[PDB]
């Protein structure tokens, strides 16, 4: 009985609480709270009534089996991992795609999906890139930002929305939400001079241009 209180002591550094166990003892007020002290189923038949044993014995046994592995602890499935993100990449940043068929295209970053990929979109009206997932590792974070704190991106779209289903035809759902968020960033990118022209141009390396030497 009771609504649980949040963890009383705050984390100081990973694995080290801020309060010692004696201060933790008085903080929980524990000093005043000392505590002292299926398989069988019967069915009727038209005979008598039979008792079925659910989950009956296996009717086959392989010639050989493998033994069970030992127990590890720090190994979680991918859905439970912690999702990092570069400090340079912040919502409103302009990125540069490197791997996918949109090489070099300068796109605008919106949000990071739970799966870990970035929900990026260059304005499809400019660089021909729709709402598209992208891995943060294969992008360059340009130091030019726009303020998209006033855009209401739909929450119905997620990593499951962009998952490859199974010839590919664009759904009407893909089109409608496309113009929905594009109609809110295009008025913002046009506020910055020559920005829409910067998004149409692709990134490329020319003679004497050295990535380690240049900042972006």
């Amino acid at each position: 009985k009771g609504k649980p209180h949040c963890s009383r002591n705050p984390v100081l550094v990973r694995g080290i609480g801020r309060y010692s166990r004696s201060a933790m003892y008085s903080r929980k007020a524990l000093y005043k709270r000392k505590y002292a002290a299926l398989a069988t189923v019967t069915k009727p038949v038209g005979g008598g009534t039979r008792v079925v044993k659910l989950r009956k014995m296996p009717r086959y046994y392989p010639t050989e089996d493998v033994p069970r592995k030992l127990l590890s602890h720090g190994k979680k499935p991918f859905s439970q991992h912690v999702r990092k993100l570069r400090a340079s990449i912040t919502p409103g940043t302009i990125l540069i795609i490197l791997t996918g068929r949109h090489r070099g295209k300068r796109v605008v970053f919106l949000k990071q999906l739970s799966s870990g990929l970035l929900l990026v979109t260059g304005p499809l009206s400019l660089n021909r890139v729709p709402l598209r997932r992208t891995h943060q590792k294969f992008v360059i974070a340009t130091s030019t930002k726009i303020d998209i704190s006033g855009v209401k991106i739909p929450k119905h779209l997620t990593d499951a929305y962009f998952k490859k289903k199974k010839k590919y035809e664009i759904t009407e759902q893909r089109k409608v939400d496309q113009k929905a968020v594009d109609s809110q960033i295009l008025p913002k990118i046009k506020a910055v001079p020559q920005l829409q022209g910067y998004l149409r141009s692709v990134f490329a390396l020319t003679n004497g241009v050295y990535p380690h030497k240049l900042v972006f």
Binding site: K34, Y35, A36, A37
Partner: peptide, 19 residues
Amino acid sequence: IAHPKLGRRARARIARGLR
């Protein structure tokens, strides 16, 4: 208290400590 044999009667107040 930490002695295994001659600490048995010593670490018995601890049984009543959490109670």
